[PDB]
Amino acid sequence: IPVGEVRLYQIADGVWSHIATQSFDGAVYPSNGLIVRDGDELLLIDTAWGAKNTAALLAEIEKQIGLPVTRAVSTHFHDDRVGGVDVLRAAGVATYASPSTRRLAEVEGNEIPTHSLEGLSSSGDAVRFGPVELFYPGAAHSTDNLVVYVPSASVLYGGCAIYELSRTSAGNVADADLAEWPTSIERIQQHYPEAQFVIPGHGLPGGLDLLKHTTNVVKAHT
Numbered sequence: 389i390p391v392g393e394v395r396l397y398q399i400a401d402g403v404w405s406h407i408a409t410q411s412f413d414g415a416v417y418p419s420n421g422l423i424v425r426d427g428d429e430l431l432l433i434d435t436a437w438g439a440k441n442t443a444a445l446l447a448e449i450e451k452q453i454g455l456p457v458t459r460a461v462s463t464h465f466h467d468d469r470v471g472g473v474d475v476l477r478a479a480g481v482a483t484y485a486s487p488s489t490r491r492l493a494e495v496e497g498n499e500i501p502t503h504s505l506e507g508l509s510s511s512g513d514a515v516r517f518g519p520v521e522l523f524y525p526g527a528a529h530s531t532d533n534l535v536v537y538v539p540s541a542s543v544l545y546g547g548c549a550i551y552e553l554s555r556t557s558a559g560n561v562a563d564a565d566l567a568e569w570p571t572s573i574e575r576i577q578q579h580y581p582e583a584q585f586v587i588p589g590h591g592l593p594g595g596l597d598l599l600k601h602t603t604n605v606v607k608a609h610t
């Protein structure tokens with residue numbers, strides 16, 4: 389994969405996913421996020437994995453959509469979710485994450501979203517944020533990982549708690565809770581059974597089978 393590629397594609401009316409490539413532990417990996425139309429504005433879910441990529445994303449949005457990103461949510465503290473928050477903040481975007489994500493990002497020395505998202509501290513908590521629903525399923529890929537649902541389009545953004553179908557073994561589990569991860573996926577399945585399009589943090593999107601597949605991989609690990 390070539391490094392530093394940033395692009396986006398439309399899933400539904402007013403719903404896009406952005407895709408970036410970045411070097412991680414020496415190799416090039418893809419990384420997904422979400423863009424959701426919020427009236428005359430856009431809500432951004434997750435950075436494009438780095439300052440340079442995220443500045444490129446903001447220009448790509450002007451080329452393809454032409455509406456201003458006014459708010460951004462990071463779904464956990466890893467650099468592929470918050471790397472670029474400083475670029476967003478300087479561009480005039482209000483950046484958000486849960487208190488736990490903000491705390492864990494600070495510990496790592498990663499960039500720190502400005503605003504705390506209240507109402508997501510207990511597994512099963514769900515809150516509306518502009519045109520999306522934010523959901524804390526419980527610990528999985530990280531203790532703080534959030535998932536995002538678009539009620540108007542039945543799009544489920546699982547973030548890095550959800551794996552793509554081609555993955556057959558667990559990935560990075562340094563920050564994960566393997567004992568809780570299957571239960572947390574079960575909460576997602578129970579709360580969003582009508583999802584028609586499911587996006588992993590890395591790799592190809594698909595249907596709801598990505599949830600059960602992720603459980604399978606996690607349990608077989610282990």
Ligand SMILES: O=C(O)c1cccc2c1C(=O)N(c1cccc(C(F)(F)F)c1)C2
Pocket residue numbers: 412417418466467468548558559560561562563590
């Ligand atoms: O889930 C994975 O194993 C995975 C797959 C593709 C790309 C990435 C991952 C993953 O866990 N990443 C990542 C990025 C920043 C920091 C970390 C950490 F902190 F877990 F090492 C992991 C990047």
Ligand SMILES: [Zn+2]
Pocket residue numbers: 464466529530548
């Ligand atoms: Zn991560």
Ligand SMILES: [Zn+2]
Pocket residue numbers: 419466468469548589590
């Ligand atoms: Zn990730």
